[PDB]
Each structure stands twice: as C-alpha cells, then as structure tokens.
Amino acid sequence: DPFYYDYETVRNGGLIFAALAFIVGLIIILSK
Amino acid sequence: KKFIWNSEKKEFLGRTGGSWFKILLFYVIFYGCLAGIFIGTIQVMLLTISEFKPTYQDRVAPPGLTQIPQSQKTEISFRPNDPQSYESYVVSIVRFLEKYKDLAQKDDMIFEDCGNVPSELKERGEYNNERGERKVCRFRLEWLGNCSGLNDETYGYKDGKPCVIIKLNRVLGFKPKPPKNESLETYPVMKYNPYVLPVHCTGKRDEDKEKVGTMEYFGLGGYPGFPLQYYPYYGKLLQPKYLQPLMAVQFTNLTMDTEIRIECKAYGENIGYSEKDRFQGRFDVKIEVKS
Amino acid sequence: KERDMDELKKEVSMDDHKLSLDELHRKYGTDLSRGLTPARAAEILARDGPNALTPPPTTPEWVKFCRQLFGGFSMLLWIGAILCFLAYGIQAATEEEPQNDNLYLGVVLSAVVIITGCFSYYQEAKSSKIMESFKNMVPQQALVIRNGEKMSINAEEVVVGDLVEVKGGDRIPADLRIISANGCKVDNSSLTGESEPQTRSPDFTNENPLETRNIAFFSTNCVEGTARGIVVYTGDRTVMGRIATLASGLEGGQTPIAAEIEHFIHIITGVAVFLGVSFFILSLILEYTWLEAVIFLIGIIVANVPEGLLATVTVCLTLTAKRMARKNCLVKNLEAVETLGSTSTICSDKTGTLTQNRMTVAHMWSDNQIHEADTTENQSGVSFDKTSATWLALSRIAGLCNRAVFQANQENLPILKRAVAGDASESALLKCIELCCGSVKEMRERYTKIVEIPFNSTNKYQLSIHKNPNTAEPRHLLVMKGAPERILDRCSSILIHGKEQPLDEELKDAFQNAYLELGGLGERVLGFCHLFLPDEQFPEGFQFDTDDVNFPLDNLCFVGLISMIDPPRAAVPDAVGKCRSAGIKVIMVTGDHPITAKAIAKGVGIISEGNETVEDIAARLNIPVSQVNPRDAKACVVHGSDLKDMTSEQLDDILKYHTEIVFARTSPQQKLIIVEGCQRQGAIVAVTGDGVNDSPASKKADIGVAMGIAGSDVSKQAADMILLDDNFASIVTGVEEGRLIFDNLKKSIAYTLTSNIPEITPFLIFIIANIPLPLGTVTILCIDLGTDMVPAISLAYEQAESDIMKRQPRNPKTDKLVNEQLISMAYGQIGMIQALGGFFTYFVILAENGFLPIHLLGLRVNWDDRWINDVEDSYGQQWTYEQRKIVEFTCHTPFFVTIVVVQWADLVICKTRRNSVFQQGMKNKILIFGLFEETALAAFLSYCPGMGVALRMYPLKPTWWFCAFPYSLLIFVYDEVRKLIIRRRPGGWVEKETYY
C-alpha cells in the first residue's frame, strides 16, 4: 500500500551518517 | 550625535540622495533576482508533483473519524428546552448536510445511483486523466433514519436523545477493508461483515458505559458503518462534489444533567489507531444533556 | 568627600627636609644618636598605625561572580528572559491551553547567562589565583637605634621620628631624613625611576624632595655604604604609600572592546525593536488583538537577540587569552586581551621596562678604537675581538682592581642575572670580565694583592699592586682606575698592541673625542691604567705600606676607557620598531635624567636617527634655542621641571605637533597627567612599566602592562596585563592578537547574525500570510544553541588575510566592531537567501504531502485548531489534528536542516572577509570539524529514536536534505563574486557598502 513508509531504514541510515560524520570530524581534529 | 538627519552637504537619515538611490536600486535588483530564483525553484517543485495524486500519503495512514457537531472540546452540552442553547449544533448539522439534499444531487452526468444495499468497492479505472470526470455515488439523507427527517430549512433534530453522525476521513485511493469474519470480540454487530466498514460506539470506563443506556445506529439500509461501494476517493480534481458515506448514532437512554464520555471506535484492518491522536480510527465525545 | 582626598593625592609631595639638625630634632623630639625611649615608640605605634601600607581592598568572590552575571551582553539576554516571562504571563491568564514555548525559552536564556557567568568567572578567577602565587612577601626587619641601643625589629613596628640605620643591602624601611652618611648610595629605581644608584648625603641639595640626597625613600634599597636617619614619613603617608593609595583609588575606564559590545547591542536592539513595533502596528492593522499583538512584539524582539553570541564571544576572547597565557603574557581581565590591538599610543617606562635596570659594561676603548660589548640580557649579540694584548691587559686591570665578588649561592645562576656584592659599576665590570674573559676567581687569586687604595672622596681613584705570575718577568704589576680626567693627569705612557708610546696629542686628543663620544651617548665612562714596577727599585721583599709615595702616580701606561650604562632588553628595539610599523605612537615617560633618556630613546627607536629636537637645531646652528621654530623639530624632550608649569592646551600642542616625544624627570603624578593628556586626543593608550611610579599610570591607561618579575607589586596589581617573562616583545604579540581577534569577532558576529533572518521570517509570514508555522521554537534552539555553536567558535581560529601589523590602528570613531555594513550583509543579503531556502524546503514538504503552497494561505486559522479533525488539503483529503501537526513538526525539522545546509556556505564565506576562499583556504581544522559535527548533530536530532516525542523533531525523507543545496551554492557564489570585486576594485561600491 502507498500508505506505508519504511521510516526505520531511513532513520537507521541517518544515524549511521551522523555517527560516521562525527568520528570523521574527530579524526580531522586529531592530525597526529 | 543623533541629528545626522541633514546638513548643507546633502545627507538624509544618515546618507546622501545619490547614495540612497544607488542602494535602493541595488536592493531592488538583488531582491528581484532572489524572487525570480525562488519562483523558478518553486516552479520546478510544482513540476515534480502531479494533479491527480499526492506524492507522499503515509502521514494519513490511519484515517480519522469525525462528527457533525464540531464542538469546541468535542462536548455536547445544551438544554432540552432552550432553543438557543443548541443552536450552534443544529447550525453545523444543517450546513454539513446541505449538500446531501435530493435537489443538490440532481445531475445524472456526475451522479450515479449506487444502491439500497451496500455492495463491493467501485473502481473507476486508474487515477489518470485519460478518462473524463468520474461519477460520484449518491447518498440521500433518508439513509440516516431518525436523524434526517423531512423537516423544513431548519432540520428539527432531537432535543432529548440527541443525534451525532460519524464520518470517515476522505483519503485518496484508500480502500477500506473491514475485519475478517473471525471478529476478535467486536461488540454485537450485524452479519454484514463483507461490504461495510463497521463503527461501534461505547463508553470509556465502568461509569460511562453504565450511564449511557441505549444507542441506536443508522446507515445505508440499516447497517452501522460505511458501504464499500463509495470507495476509493479519486481526488477533488477528478471527483468534485463527492459525498463520502455517513452513519448516524443516537443516544436514547442518557442520564440527563451528567457529562458522560463516549468513544466511537471504527474497526477494520486498514483502520489504525494512535495513543497520541484520539481521532485516528477512534473518536471521542463528551455528551451532557442538562435540563 | 573622597574627591578632595584624591585631588590632594594627584599633587606632587611637599616636605620639611630643608631643616637644621637642631630644628629637626626640636620638631620631632628625638635624640640624634640615641633615638627615643621604647615607650615613646610604642606610644606612637599604637597612635597612628604600623609602618606598612593598608592592605588592598579585598574583593569577595560572590561580588565578582554577580559581576560576571551582569554586564552589557548578559544584560540583553536578561531583558530577553524577562520579556519571555512577561509574554508567557500574558499568554497564561488570557487564553486556553497556553503554549509552553515562551517559558522553556525564558529558562533557557537564563541558563545561558548563568553558564556564561560560571565559565567567565572561572577564567578570571584562575588568572587571579595564579597571580596570588607570585606574592612572595618576605618580612624585612629594620635596624633601629632607640634609647641609645641598636635593635632589629619588624618593619611595621617602626614609627615616626626615630633613628634608623641602614647597611649596604638592607632596604630603606620608611621615608628617612638622612643625618649622617658614609659613602652611601641608595636605589631610587622602583620609585623615581632613577637608574644609576643615587647617593644620599645629609646635606640638603635640591628643593624637590625626590631629587635631594637628604631623604631615603620607602621600598628603596641602600646599594652600598651605611647611613643614619630620622623617620619623617611612615605607613600610607609615605611617598610610595601616597602613590599606591592613588593607584587603588583611580578609575578603570571603559575598555574599547566593551564599548564595541555596547554599540553592538545598540544596533541589535535598535533593529529588534524597530521590527517588533512596526510588526505590532502591522498585526493590529490586520486583525489580531492587543493581547495577541503584544505577544507578537515580544516574540519578534526576543527572536532578534543572539542567544549564543554570548558564549561564542566569551570563548573567542578566552581562546586568544589562552594564547596570551601560552607566551607567559597573562591577562587579568578577559576582555583586556583585545585592547592591545586597538592601541594607537604606547606610553612606556625606561628603567626596568625599556631597559634592563642594571649597570652593564657598554663600550670599551683599546688601540684608539671603540669596541662595543654585548649588552643583551641573555647574551645573544656580537662578541668583540678578544685576542689582542691590549685586551689581555685591560681585562686584568678591571678583574683585579675592583671591589666586586660573587656571593655564596652564585653558582648555578647565569653570569649576568646572578647577584654581585659591591658597587654597581664594579658589578658590571666583574660580570663583563667573568663573561668575555673566562673567570675572575682564579684570575684574581693569580695576582696576590699586596697594598690597595680604595676610592677617594676627592680625585676619586682606586689603585692596588699585585705580584706577577708570568714565567718571564718578576716585576710587580700595579693597576689603577678612575675618572678619565683624574687618570689623564697621572699618565705619560700609552699601550698599543702590546708596546708603549708617549702621550702624543695626535692620539691623546683622539682619546678625548672618544671620551666625549661615550659620554655624550648617556653612558658613564671610566679609565684603566697599569704599570710594571721595576723590581730593581722595589724588590720582591720590599713592602709598600700605604702611607707615602711608594708608587709612581704619573708615568703610568693607559690601556683604555670602559663605559657602562643600563642596556635595553633584547627584543626591546625590534619590538618598538614593530609597534611604529603598526602605526603606534611610542612615547617614553620616565623620571630618569634627560641626558640618559634621550640616548636610550634614540637607541630603542622612540627617537628616529636623523630627527632633531628643538635644542639639537639650535646646537647645529650655534644660535639660541629661543630662535628655532618648534615646527622644524619633529622630536622633543620635555623636562619634568618645565612640565609642572604646563596647561592643558600646551600639552595638547606638545602631542599634536611633535611625533617623537620623551618626557624626562616626570613624577608619577605627572605620568598620570601625561596618560590623561594622551586620552584627551581620543586615542587608545597602553602604559608599559615596572616601578611603583607606573601604578597611577598603568591604572588610568586603557591597558597597563607590568613586568612580571622586574616590576613592583603595586604597579603589577594596578595593571591590566602581566608579562611573566618580561619579554617586552609580548607587547607586539598583544597588538597583533588584539587586531586578529577583533577581525575574527567581526566574522563570528556576522555569522550568528545571519541566521536570525531564517528564524524570524517564518513567524513574520506566519502572521502576514496566515500559513502554518514553518519553523519551530525548539528547532531554533537546536540552531542558535545547538549546531551553530561549533562553527561560530571555529571562526575565531581564522588567521590574517593580509599583514595586520602593517595597517594603521583602527579609529575608534570610525572602525566599529559591528558597523552598518555587517547588518546589510547578515540581515540584508545572506540571511535573506537562507530564509528563502527554508521556505522552499517548507513548501516542498507541504506540497508533496498534499498541501499545495497556493492552498496554504489563510489555512493556519483552522490548521492550529485542536478539534477540527477534517482539514481539507489540495487533493480533498481530510487531515486530523495530530496528523497535520506531525507534518508541521516534520516540516520544522527540515527547516532546521536547511538552516545548517545554508550555514555551510555562510561559514565558508564569513571565514574570509576580503580574500577568496581559494586564496585563504580550508586549513582551519576546527572549522572542518565544525561542519562535520554540525551536520552529524543535525542528522542525529532528526533520526534519533524518540525525537518526535521529546523535541517533536521527526525523521526526514532523504529528498528533504537536498532542498537547501542550491541556496547554499548561491550564497557561496554571491559572496565569492563580492570578495572578487572587492579585490579587483578596492575603490568604493563593493568596499564601502558590503565589506564589513
């Protein structure tokens, strides 16, 4: 039915994006 | 230092005349370009949507269940004697049912007589514009017994034992699916389970269920629900002047001068509920006929 | 009535020193050789107060915490919180089911102010805490003669009118009136700035109590010799006591950064109340009631208040102060980190600040040639030629014939900073020989001294004879030093490259011009000579008892002169040059003698070589000084004696027509008058000093700089910045950072001010067009106090776009921190584009979910209704209350996301004010992390489980994330072409209208 949206997959992708972008930024401020 | 208004060397409100013209011309050109850009992008956005169907329909997944007297707090408090006490209710009922009169549904080119018995769904092809303007099944006020009458311009409704009709939220392409014959305890209802969306009212707790004595439902042919022959909806553009099904509910044995809560819950598989939205699927009302 | 008390302290002191010993003892009632009875001493001790300055005014910690909770910025946030609770009170009693937004917002604003107070307080408190760890007040007992007996008592138990004795090394307790001296020299450096140790004689010499020699002063140190004296002044009534009490009771003023924040708030609230009032009238003209319109006025005004700009500005200042503390340049006041950059006139001190305040061997004479020795404080300069025989002879004359030796713990300390016992001149000589000629220990004991002759009261000469350890000659080595006029009369032979020659005038006059060269240079010169005593007329057994002529006074062999002076610190001249390069007027203000002040001025850069004083022109033309026009003289020396007889207009003209000025022989009170004269012009002033005389000048200055070790405690407390390493170049570092953080604050302010437009515009068109609310309140908090915090903080780390130490100091009446160009950019152009992008994402979400944008007009009337659960969209569908509210909140979330997307471009363009992003470069790692964290946080707030429940922020369909991309690209391109026209066309349109 068109009255359903897979919100869990989009939500999961957004949380993975938020996690990766934050750890990448941490690597950015840790130049070693 | 705050009298920089003018000087003999040309300044107004802080700057000269030629500077005022230069800045004003720049801001006009700039904002004009901004407006044109916003308009062009909004036009592309208009090109990404169609005229016969909304792109996203998941935010209206469980249809609502409204009533005719759109009360300020879903409460019906009036006096069985004072005619002005219940004027706000009757006014909305007459204005709502003003489009269901036999004179309003007179054109045979846009109206189609569905039938005296609830039948299966009526699919009028696809949602495109290849076909002309679809037909809308008629729904005469006679179906809602004891809550329609053959009254004059003012529908003399029920003072004692009021009437409250219920309506299913009109949704495009929505196909109602009543519960299976394996009904999981759905409060005594007729055996017309296959071609009508059931709606059953009740109290809310041990007190309200006892105060509300008897309830009488009215619908198409006498069934407490919505007939499937009126669904699905094909949008306002393709089906203007569409009449969604109606079903009235009258509370005969009420305890006068007592505010009692009623919950009219619509049952079905394609009918969801929500603990946050008391209107999704279900419906609440606080009736109090104080004499 | 404290005005009169302070006025009687701005006046230079008076005295009664010019009195016969009998008139003095009669006025005070004291035995000149026995002092007074101990009962009389205690009777005065318990009469007027112990000999010690009244402690500073204690500043309780709750007072300065309440101070940090107020101010100008935190006050704007306070009035914002008040307006929030006022609007909430109007909303509660008047309507059903009030919205809690305003209350949530008021408590958040209050929390912002409180937390900013806690952070700023912890920082200023940390500065004062590390400052208390520098008060090493060691009690010092004085030697007092009372009732005819010598006793050593605490300095506070000393009273007025009693005999006090001081020994070379001891500190002068109170203000004494010398009665009997024995070649006594005191150190008036920390008080009157007199560099060389001024001697103290019982005879009255000058009408000024500071210049005369019959007065010892509080906190001064008797360098050499011993003396006696009657205590004239005690406690706070003393000279340095009146100076310190004046310092504490002076005004701090308004820092330039604070005045900039104040004018900034003036513009913020100006446009805020303009928008609020004009929209209040507009809303009443439409349909809304006074009850509603008042809420609209408060909402628009409160919304136009930068909630997070407070924490960002605080962290900006704190970051620059961190870098200051890294270079041992601690700031006591936080905002004081900015004042150095805005400075345009530095008043510096000579003794101890411009100089090292220490006698050092400056130049030497040998082979009729001048040899300049390295006089840096850390020994990082050119080393003279040390391979000639003239040097091997002169170095022994100095290392042997000198009453100077190192002390006990003088081992691990460097050769210069270590303590030397004896005369200051002999100390400089001992250090120079110990530094450029190996060691003086084994060099002094190598020549066993037989008979010596110390310095004489008349014809001051110091001689001594020693045995000769050479393996070729047993003749006795006699050496003598003294003033060149005393040695020229007792010399006939002259040393050159190892051999001797007669006193021919061809080289003797060449010696005289060298003497006047090193002397006219403000230095003190001495002459050194030696002679080989014939072992045939004075054998190795003969003893030359110091009575008769056993040594030939004349016919000696002159080796060379040795001058000496207090040298400037190492990076002092270069730093002065850097300040002049930045357009900072350098003005010397010292109480030392003008003959030395002018030389140090020319030596450090205050007086440029070639520029002439009003006296120099009269000397080059051999004409009276009253004839030359002062306009032909760029530089000028102003004597303190003449400064006493000056008016306001005269000092104004001295500063207006003379570019290089040097104030000599000026009292601390006159220093304050000079600082005030500089401030009358309207320029930012920075006073750099060390002594107590710099206390009233460092206090009244826009920013005071005290030396962390070579400075006195009073001027160190009355100052606003401390140089814990005494590296005067830190002043250059400060003026650079003060301009740097100024420009970066401009960038950060324009960044936080740009987001206000796509925050208030939703509410504005919500009132006008009657459309559903596009942006939520909690989302606005997730922007102003959420995402944007890291980018705005990172904007402080931006570097210089051009050379800031090259441009002239900012004009306070012209270059404001937030001028009308920044408002035209943030509120006018960038924020406008961001608002359009937000509304675009808004219309996309609503049109895609069934509510076409044209249909959204006048829909809020029934949209906000909580009971109309059948609201028709554009497709005829019926929406319940919570369903459409879910859409509105899931429409607020992408509006917030859109804010972050356009803030990407806004941050990159605000990072550079004139240069191109390609030119400057994304080398700011904190900014990169700012964008990554900003985006990740924005995504987390939308996709975390339970956000549509707690913060009512619902997850987004991925296409929403791209609705804002074109607007950001547009912002970046527009600002890039803006900075490009600013580069290619530096004339006026793009520069005077948008460049802020």
Ligand SMILES: *[C@@H]1O[C@H](CO)[C@@H](O[C@@H]2O[C@H](CO)[C@@H](O)[C@H](O)[C@H]2NC(C)=O)[C@H](O)[C@H]1NC(C)=O
């Ligand atoms: C509608 O209302 C009418 C009254 O106007 C009801 O008619 C009554 O019905 C009962 C049986 O339930 C009879 O005993 C009465 O004699 C009837 N009275 C009249 C005046 O007709 C009718 O039942 C109601 N309809 C429904 C479906 O409840």
Ligand SMILES: *[C@@H]1O[C@H](CO)[C@@H](O[C@@H]2O[C@H](CO)[C@@H](O)[C@H](O)[C@H]2NC(C)=O)[C@H](O)[C@H]1NC(C)=O
């Ligand atoms: C309608 O409700 C009334 C109550 O309001 C019912 O009548 C009551 O019955 C109880 C016994 O259970 C008596 O004690 C009361 O005195 C009765 N009241 C009245 C007014 O009669 C009545 O039975 C209900 N009728 C229907 C058809 O539901």
Ligand SMILES: CC(C)CCC[C@@H](C)[C@H]1CC[C@H]2[C@@H]3CC=C4C[C@@H](O)CC[C@]4(C)[C@H]3CC[C@]12C
């Ligand atoms: C201008 C460029 C370089 C910025 C780089 C960041 C861009 C490419 C990133 C930042 C945020 C990102 C989005 C983050 C969140 C969502 C939801 C997720 O479930 C699907 C991906 C999607 C839709 C991403 C698409 C790509 C995106 C827009």
Ligand SMILES: CC(C)CCC[C@@H](C)[C@H]1CC[C@H]2[C@@H]3CC=C4C[C@@H](O)CC[C@]4(C)[C@H]3CC[C@]12C
């Ligand atoms: C000169 C060039 C670069 C300008 C071209 C304008 C581009 C960048 C603009 C014009 C219309 C815009 C689109 C309008 C419609 C949609 C559908 C929506 O669900 C997501 C946003 C999205 C995908 C927009 C992305 C950016 C877009 C394509």
Ligand SMILES: C[C@]12CC[C@H](O)C[C@H]1CC[C@@H]1[C@@H]2CC[C@]2(C)[C@@H](c3ccc(=O)oc3)CC[C@]12O
């Ligand atoms: C309570 C409120 C009244 C007007 C209308 O009924 C909508 C209501 C909900 C939203 C609320 C407004 C009031 C102003 C805001 C706090 C105001 C605001 C927002 C953020 C901020 O920092 O300062 C002010 C703009 C909108 C606002 O958040």
Ligand SMILES: *[C@@H]1O[C@H](CO)[C@@H](O)[C@H](O)[C@H]1NC(C)=O
């Ligand atoms: C449901 O079951 C009942 C008997 O239990 C039967 O009478 C009725 O016809 C059934 N309806 C359907 C739609 O199967």
Ligand SMILES: [Mg+2]
């Ligand atoms: Mg704000």
Ligand SMILES: [Mg+2]
């Ligand atoms: Mg000094």
Ligand code: NA
């Ligand atoms: Na100050």
Ligand SMILES: [Rb+]
């Ligand atoms: Rb903001």
